[PDB]
Amino acid sequence: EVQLVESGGDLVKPGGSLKLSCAASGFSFSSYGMSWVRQTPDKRLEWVATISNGGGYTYYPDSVKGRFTISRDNAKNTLYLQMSSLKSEDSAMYYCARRERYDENGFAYWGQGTLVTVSAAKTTAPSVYPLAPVCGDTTGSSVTLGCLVKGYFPEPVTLTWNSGSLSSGVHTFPAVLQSDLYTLSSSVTVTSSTWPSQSITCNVAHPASSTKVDKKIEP
Amino acid sequence: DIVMTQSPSSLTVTAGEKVTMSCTSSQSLFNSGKQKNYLTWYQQKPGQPPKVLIYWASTRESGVPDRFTGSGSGTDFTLTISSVQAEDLAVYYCQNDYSNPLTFGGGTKLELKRADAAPTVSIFPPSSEQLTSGGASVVCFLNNFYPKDINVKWKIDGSERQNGVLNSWTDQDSKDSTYSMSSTLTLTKDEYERHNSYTCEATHKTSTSPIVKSFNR
């Protein structure tokens, strides 16, 4: 079974250095060349480097030329990439992929990906806000309520409505970056016969700072 | 470099129907020697890496289903799915694999056809907890509508507010094929304390007029 597992992705200061590893299996590593192919957050896919099977030929796009180096260890079945002078445009999912030297048929075998984030930001735990309905709109059939998780770094955040037991009628909107800090928002819909008799508490977890915050929507 | 181009960006499909995606290199991907085009088509569903679907423009890979066919030569390439099934709602990429630098198109992303629905719009004043700290974010949600293109406007006492709004759209919900959007206007407590009403105005093909949600202090 061809297995290409990557490691190394992390938060890096811009103008830093990072070195990822790709460990291959279920084939003879040395008969095949390899590539690093990355994915940006806009899901733009791009090639980064290719190294031929005996490490005697390496290939780079201008973006990455003279900043990254692809190398291999044929004895240890491991492929590498030394990133240096990391800009924030290089935050992406980095995939190792085999070059199909025999079949010449594209990237048939990809790895799992490892994620690099190049940001000068600092861990900041968020502010969670309960968004309680307002006018006489309030009572109909459903009341919609929400949570504003404003200003955090990095990701992830786990948001639930009452610890997971309220999944029907929930909408969590993507995080957006507004100068180093993110913001996320969620809403849940429940009947007029549900809140404010029953209680809903939005729970946000931000593991990167040990934050655990329960925010009750109350009128 | 051989720049690649994919059209359309989104494609709304109905299952059982034939759908066509196009790919365009800026330079012929035709290998005169081997006599084939070195253009590959990829499918990535979310979480997964890409998957090889067709290589050498037209040669379907092993285990790929019959309904997928690659067509075209030189600079113009075409992927066909002929009974688009529900498990094809993915993103499709074409790739120059002729000359390094290897270049990928932008993707065409399938979404599923469904009837029009109107945004369910709701506005929220700032929380006292927020408002304690000097911030005033007003939130408006536009949940469960179809088709995907909606426009939002914030007005504060009838004037159009331009800057300070952040928006986050979602992908086509799995369970009912709809889309959702949120819009937060963020202001200072100062600003917030000199305006009496905030209106969230939204337009969607479902509606002749913008949809209006306001609150007053």
Partner: peptide, 7 residues
């Protein structure tokens, strides 16, 4: 050790 075919 052969070069890369897309080269």
């Amino acid at each position: 050790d052969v070069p890369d075919y897309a080269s």
